[PDB]
């Protein structure tokens, strides 16, 4: 909640080049609480950064 809301909380910001580097965090981080597939969270955040304007 204080980390996933960092990546989620910078989706409103919209600065792209780092948003490219947030999904590497949703790989790095999202798995450390549960090592099970984050490809749900991964994929959802992928579309979340892809739906970014332009």
Q: Resolution to 1 decimal, in Å? A: 3.5
* Structure determined by: cryo-EM
Helix (H, G, I), strand (E, B) or coil at 12: coil
Q: How far is CA 12 from CA 3, 5, 29, 33, 35, in A?
A: 15, 11, 20, 25, 27
By CB neighbour count within 10 A (0-12 exposed, 13-18 middle, 19+ buried), where does 30 fall? buried
Q: Among positive and negative, which fits the CA dihedral 5, 21, 17, 44?
A: negative
CA atoms within 13 A on the CB side of 47: 5
Strands (E), the chain: none
Q: Report long-range pairs for 21-28 (Cβ below 8 Å, ≥24 apart).
A: 22/49, 23/49
Tokens of 16: 């792209």
């Amino acid at each position: 909640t204080s980390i996933l809301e960092l990546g989620q909380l910078y989706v409103t910001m919209g600065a792209k080049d780092k948003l490219r580097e947030f999904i590497p965090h949703s790989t790095e981080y999202m798995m450390q609480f549960a090592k099970s597939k984050t490809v749900k969270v991964l994929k959802t955040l992928i579309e979340k950064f892809e739906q970014v304007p332009d």
